Design a binder for this molecule. Sequence first.
Ligand SMILES: NC(=O)[C@@H]1CCC(=O)N([C@@H]2CCCc3ccccc32)C1
Ligand SMILES: [Zn+2]
Length: 140
Amino acid sequence: SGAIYVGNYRVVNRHLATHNDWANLVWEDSSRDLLVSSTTAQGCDTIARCDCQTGVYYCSSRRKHYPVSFSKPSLIFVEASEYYPARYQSHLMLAVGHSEPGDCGGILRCQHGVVGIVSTGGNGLVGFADVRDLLWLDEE
Ligand SMILES: NC(=O)[C@@H]1CCC(=O)N([C@@H]2CCCc3ccccc32)C1
Ligand SMILES: [Zn+2]
């Protein structure tokens, strides 16, 4: 579990969105595993606007933050899980690292701010859903 809280937005994995998220929906994209809902309180996270390929992510299944090198956001084939059939996931970045399903939502960040959140994994790989291209998170 986990979310990004920026301005009056809450960014969560679409497969973990609550009824309150769907009832206050701003934007959702199944192919990216992302959903954004509106909040009453203002959040403290800042989104990175960069092309960094090194950062640090939070792994709840180890209670640890790990430094990682990660690939550029791309269209990657992800195997079937309990939440999605086997399909291509877009805007996904991979790194070598530990990840279990419940690790989804952990933040990946760099020197500029939040880059994305854990969305995929298994077998010593961890995949992050990028949010750096969602410029509208910084306004309205
Ligand atoms: N985004 C997707 O297509 C799904 C979302 C839910 C989900 O459990 N995953 C994978 C399954 C394999 C292990 C694993 C480890 C860590 C995190 C996520 C996963 C991918
Ligand atoms: Zn950066």
